[PDB]
Design a protein around this nucleic acid. Structure first.
Ligand code: ZN
Ligand code: ZN
Ligand code: ZN
Ligand code: ZN
Lengths: 89, 46, 66, 260, 111, 391, 183, 66
RNA sequence: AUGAUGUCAUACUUAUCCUGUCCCUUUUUUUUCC
């Protein structure tokens, strides 16, 4: 019902809302923000400008990856903007 | 909300509790069980 | 996983697994300047002709399937 | 910020009041709560407050216990855990099981927050993980495995791999099960162990399982072997063993046998 | 060094509009370059040329002045060779030369 | 699932999900069971596909949003679950169906299935449909399908944009009206998801459109204005100089129509046309602003929702060009107006404006009227909301 | 044939019962005998789901590493009425542990398994690592011999045991230090 | 916390009424005849107070007496 | 000496949950008069 879109990673910076603000996306954790999130403008566009990567609210900050997902190199896969398995809006 | 079906665990624990405390103290026995009241424990005994 | 080449599964055959590790070895050879140069030294050719023979052996190796 | 203006007695009372704030149905409440608990942990110092954490009845599940666990972590950071560990490790002794798995979680988050500093304490935790990973009940194997994970990412590159191999022994039997949380746990485990130990040892545990007659073993060992395969696919080359060539196919890669 | 991961072969347009990066197999990516308002170089978002089961011998930039850029990709398909138990596809299979055309307006890369 | 088979289930379900007395929750739950069983059954559902969609397509048009995202999800799972030819061969007879309802919701259905199985697979079907010579209703449907594909897929339309345009272009000149209207509308949706790229793909479409801009009365006109509106940001500031300067006239003249569809369109238009970097301030300041604040700022608008928002945005952008003190200076006096929602509107407008441009431009007296306005409006609050506070 | 398949391997012992049913035995024969690789765990074909609580009910709860034992925390940790608990909140006393931060800056620095060839499986604990030639301390005490165990004097006369034929025990054919008198 | 008192009180009550029931190295209750694991001793006791647990003791009774 | 079938029951897991959210459902026989 909820899974990654995994379109090619662009240069656009990730945007998280109030709620999701502190979370590293994949590890679900708050620890050691280090690197930065990138998603395609196909996932981030228009009404998605400054949109949350998750809930669909306005982004108040930018997501940072953990060090855990860093060494395991998961941050380099397709754009980790969750799509519900209906549309994205 | 508290009401519901009686369970072998609740029923055996009711046996032991009645054995230990005695017949006239219901509030003490209802204290041990969950989702059941004193009236229900007494009427369930008798 | 599927769209990631080299993905295995329970039904994976010998032939496919070994031809995989072959092709990956060859991409490593194309990759590392030195080890390539070692190959050029040992069997005398150009760096070029080496890489060329490898690129010929990419699809074949072990030969036909079963 | 200030924290000096108020006497310690007031503080510890604040603690014993903070303890039941963890019934909150909201996540941000618990957030601020734990971080505060760390701050006052700095204002006082570890032993008393971590003892007050270990007082916990564990009474309900999540919703929460494990928040107290997080407090044990952050408290172990705020002043050196280099002090705190023996108390905890002793408190695994207690026969009550849910708090045993509790302190296992405490180790997990603990290494997650400490990172590099685990280059020492690995040894201390190693035999206890042995006791925990050896299974009383599944949650032991699971949580302990998570500990092995975060430890395994944290210690990377510092030369402690040996004991991590030893622990990998006891990790290895747990590979088989259908329980989602323990199987995904074990997956994270063996991934961290992949990066820490290096692929060669992993693959040396994953070879024979690939072609085994049964379907189960192949399903799993191929899942593992894929996890090992995607990352570090570049470094695997050396470790594929020698496999003899059959009739129609040449399975020997002779390039590696060119000798000057 | 990977099989499918780019960085292996590298080409760029004479006008420097778009640089094309490529692996040995399956992945050929393009970054478009334009100087900023200050004439300082800014890089675009990537694109995807992906073509399944295709070996890339070499990639060379192509000259088209102020046009939709072209790229010369040497390719070969082994999918003919894997499904041919006889071994005929080992021979009788010629490496395909393909020119990809980047298109700025449509902002994708079409064969 | 695998045991009972899809036949008995749907036979015993579809009546319930069809029930006239159905709840909200009960509906949603039956939707859940349909999903969960359709994660398993794959080849089995082929006979029931239409028999499903007939109940499900009403989920796509609904007041509830979550109902809509659910519906799109389960039709995605159904189409991908079944085969392409299953879907196609299934859903043809609903194209010419007398009722337009089924035609519409069916169009959104094709949108969903096309998101599932991709545009190029389904193209020849469409491209065959829009050229159907039987009757117009079909072509109307297929064009609507082009649109709903534009909305759903959105940014991802990009590769096949050319072929899509090449399909739709033949309807702009058709003798029937609807087909023309909905056509140009679909161009609009395209370009809006086409945000700037692929301008030349729309190329051959233009010259008729501009011509039509002259001769049209009524809704179709406004529709063209919608299309052209979303187009202009995609043109070159030189060609779009001329073309824009032509659009401005009609844009002016058409402020006054009572049609609210009209006012929406021409509004967003004014945003895009006059928010163009290649437009001169003074020309807007003279020609536009006085009629703009005259007709557009009224208590018909603000009570509505979409008109409220869009109005906010357009005004914000006009501020972004002509500057701050103008707009604010004209709308300050309305902070003291009776109604709330209106005060809320000008209040959030001032908020965004002073957010972007900065307060430095503001003079003294107008600043007195500012602070007094903001206190006064803040002193009467019928509801609790952030707009006044953040403001 | 499972018979002749055993002639094609350097260590045919690796071939087992279900091995002959493998989809590719002609390889797995060559893998399973690979130099340093380790065997698959044995808990499958046992339907018991990898464990039971038979031997696991006699285990100790836990025992600390000696480095943590010398510290002294063990005695500090060890009860309370409810009103004393609400008194413990109103009264409260501080510093019950009162640890020495020097000591816990000392132990883990100043003071402070298995190789790769092993892997754990379900029931295995002690046995492999009491064998012919290897006994426990106390039973030495009952035996009462000062530092062969004396019935390996009779393993001279009557012969090497049928049960453990590979046997060597000290002084006879096995040419011994501490406890372990045979291997 | 009130919940904590119940756990304590329902262990002691199942200790009074209690030779087979025990507690493993973890905290769970177990019947050493039947090899069953019980979430709460009272819940476990009921299984311990059941007619199946009864039988398997008699069967092991006979099985030893032979 | 733990197989299968049962809507008995209790523990337990996931820093999952509990506040986010309304924005393109606007669908009709073209039809706003110096
Ligand atoms: Zn995407
Ligand atoms: Zn969010
Ligand atoms: Zn992460
Ligand atoms: Zn029993």
């Amino acid at each position: 019902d909820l899974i990654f879109c995994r379109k090619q990673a662009g240069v656009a910076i990730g945007r998280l809302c109030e709620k999701c603000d502190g979370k590293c996306v994949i590890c679900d954790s708050y620890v050691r923000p280090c690197t930065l999130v990138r998603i395609c403008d196909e996932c981030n566009y228009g009404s998605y400008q400054g949109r949350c990567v998750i809930c669909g609210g306005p982004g108040v900050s930018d997501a940072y990856y953990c060090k855990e997902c860093t060494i395991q190199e998961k941050d380099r896969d397709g754009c980790p903007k969750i799509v519900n398995l209906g549309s994205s809006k | 909300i508290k009401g519901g079906v009686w369970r072998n665990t609740e029923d055996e624990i009711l046996k032991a509790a009645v054995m230990k405390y005695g017949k006239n103290q219901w509030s003490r026995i209802a204290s041990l069980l969950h989702r059941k009241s004193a009236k229900q424990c007494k009427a369930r005994w008798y | 996983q599927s769209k990631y080449i080299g993905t295995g599964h329970a039904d994976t055959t010998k032939w496919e697994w070994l031809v995989n590790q072959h092709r990956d070895s060859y991409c490593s050879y194309m990759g590392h300047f030195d080890l390539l140069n070692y190959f050029a030294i040992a069997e005398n050719e150009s760096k070029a002709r080496v890489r060329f023979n490898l690129m010929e052996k990419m699809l074949q190796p072990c030969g036909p399937p079963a | 910020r200030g924290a000096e203006y108020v006497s310690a007695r007031e503080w510890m009372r604040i603690c014993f009041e903070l303890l039941e704030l963890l019934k909150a149905h909201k996540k941000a409440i618990r957030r601020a709560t734990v971080n505060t608990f760390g701050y006052i942990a700095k204002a006082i110092g570890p032993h008393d407050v971590l003892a007050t954490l270990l007082n916990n009845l564990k009474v309900q599940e999540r919703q929460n216990r494990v928040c107290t666990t997080v407090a044990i972590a952050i408290v172990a950071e705020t002043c050196s855990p280099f002090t705190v560990l023996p108390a905890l490790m002793n408190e695994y002794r207690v026969p009550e099981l849910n708090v045993q798995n509790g302190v296992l979680k405490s180790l997990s988050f603990l290494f997650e927050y400490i990172g590099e500093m685990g280059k020492d304490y690995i040894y201390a935790v190693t035999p206890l993980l042995e006791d925990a990973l050896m299974d009383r009940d599944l949650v032991h194997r699971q949580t302990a495995s998570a500990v092995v994970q975060h430890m395994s990412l944290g210690v990377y590159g510092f030369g402690c791999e040996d004991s991590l191999n030893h622990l990998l022994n006891y990790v290895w039997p747990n590979v088989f099960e259908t329980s989602p949380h323990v199987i995904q746990a074990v997956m994270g485990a063996l991934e961290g162990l992949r990066v820490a130990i290096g692929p060669c040892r992993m693959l040396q545990y994953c070879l024979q399982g690939l072609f085994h007659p049964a379907r189960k073993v192949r399903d799993v060992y191929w899942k593992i072997y894929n996890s090992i395969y995607i990352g570090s696919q570049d470094a695997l080359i050396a470790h594929y063993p020698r496999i003899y060539n059959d009739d129609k196919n040449t399975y020997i890669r002779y390039e590696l046998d060119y000798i000057l | 060094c990977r099989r499918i991961v780019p960085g292996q072969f590298l080409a760029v347009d004479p006008k420097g509009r778009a640089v094309m990066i490529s692996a040995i197999e399956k992945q050929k990516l393009v970054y478009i370059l334009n100087r900023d308002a200050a004439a300082r170089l800014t890089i675009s978002s990537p694109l995807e040329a992906h073509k399944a089961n295709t070996l890339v011998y070499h990639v060379v930039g192509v000259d088209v002045g102020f046009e939709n850029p072209m790229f010369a990709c040497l390719e070969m398909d082994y999918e003919e060779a894997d499904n041919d138990p006889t071994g005929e596809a080992a021979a009788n299979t010629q490496q395909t030369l393909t020119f990809y055309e980047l298109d700025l307006g449509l902002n994708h890369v079409v064969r | 699932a695998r045991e009972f088979g899809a036949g008995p289930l749907f036979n015993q379900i579809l009546p319930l999900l069809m029930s006239p007395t159905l709840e909200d929750q009960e509906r949603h739950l039956l939707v859940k069971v349909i999903d969960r069983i359709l994660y398993k059954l794959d080849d089995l559902v082929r006979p029931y596909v239409h028999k499903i969609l007939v109940v499900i397509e009403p989920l796509l048009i609904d007041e509830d949003y979550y109902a809509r995202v659910e519906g799109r999800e389960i039709i995605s799972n159904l189409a991908k679950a079944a085969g392409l030819a299953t879907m196609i061969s299934t859903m043809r007879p609903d194209i010419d169906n007398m009722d337009e309802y089924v035609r519409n919701t069916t169009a959104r259905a094709f949108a969903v299935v096309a998101s599932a199985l991709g545009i190029p697979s389904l193209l020849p079907f469409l491209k065959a449909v829009c050229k159907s010579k039987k009757s117009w209703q079909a072509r109307h449907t297929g064009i609507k399908i082009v649109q709903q594909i534009a909305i759903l897929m959105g940014c991802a339309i990009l590769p096949h944009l050319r072929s899509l345009v090449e399909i739709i272009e033949h309807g702009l000149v058709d003798e029937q009206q609807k087909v023309r209207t909905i056509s140009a509308l679909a161009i609009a949706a395209l370009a809006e998801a086409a945000t700037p790229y692929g301008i030349e793909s729309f190329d051959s479409v233009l010259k008729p459109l501009w011509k039509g801009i002259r001769q049209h009365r009524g809704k179709g006109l406004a529709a063209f204005l919608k299309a052209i509106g979303y187009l202009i940001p995609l043109m070159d500031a030189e060609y779009a100089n001329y073309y824009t300067r032509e659009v401005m006239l009609i844009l002016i003249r058409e402020f006054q129509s009572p049609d609210e569809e009209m006012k929406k369109i021409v509004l967003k238009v004014v945003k895009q046309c006059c928010g163009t970097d290649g437009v001169e301030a003074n020309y807007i300041k003279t020609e536009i602003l006085p009629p703009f604040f005259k007709h557009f700022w009224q208590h018909r608008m603000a009570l509505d929702r979409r008109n409220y928002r869009q109005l906010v945005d357009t005004t914000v952008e006009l501020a972004n060009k002509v500057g701050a003190a103008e707009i604010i200076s004209r709308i300050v006096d309305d902070l003291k107006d009776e109604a709330e929602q209106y005060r809320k509107m000008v209040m959030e407008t001032i908020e965004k404006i002073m957010g972007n441009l900065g307060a430095a431009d503001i003079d003294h007296k107008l600043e007195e009227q500012l602070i007094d306005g903001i206190l006064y409006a803040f002193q009467e609050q019928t509801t609790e909301d952030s707009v006044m506070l953040n403001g | 044939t499972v018979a002749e398949l055993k002639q094609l391997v350097a260590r045919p012992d690796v071939v087992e019962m279900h091995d002959v049913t493998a989809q590719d035995p002609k390889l797995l024969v060559h893998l399973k005998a690979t130099r340093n690789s380790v065997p698959v765990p044995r808990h499958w074909c046992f339907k018991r789901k990898y464990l039971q609580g038979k031997r696991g009910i006699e285990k100790p709860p836990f025992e600390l590493p000696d480095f943590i034992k010398r510290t002294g925390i063990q005695e500090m940790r060890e009860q309370k009425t409810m009103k004393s608990k609400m008194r413990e909140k109103v009264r409260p006393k501080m510093g019950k542990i009162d640890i020495d931060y020097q000591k816990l800056h000392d132990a883990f620095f100043k003071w402070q398994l298995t190789i790769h060839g092993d892997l754990y499986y379900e029931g295995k604990e002690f046995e492999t690592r009491k064998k012919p030639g290897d006994l426990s301390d106390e039973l030495r005490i009952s035996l009462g011999m000062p530092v062969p165990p004396p019935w390996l004097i009779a393993m001279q006369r009557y012969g090497p045991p049928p049960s453990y034929p590979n046997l060597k025990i000290p002084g006879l054919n096995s040419p011994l230090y501490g406890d372990v008198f045979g291997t | 916390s009130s919940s904590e008192s119940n756990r304590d009180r329902r262990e002691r009550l199942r200790q009074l009424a209690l030779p087979y029931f025990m507690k493993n190295h973890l905290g769970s209750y177990e019947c050493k005849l039947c090899l069953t694991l019980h979430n709460n001793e009272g819940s476990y006791l009921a299984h311990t107070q059941g007619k199946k647990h009864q039988t398997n003791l008699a069967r092991r009774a006979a099985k030893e007496a032979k």
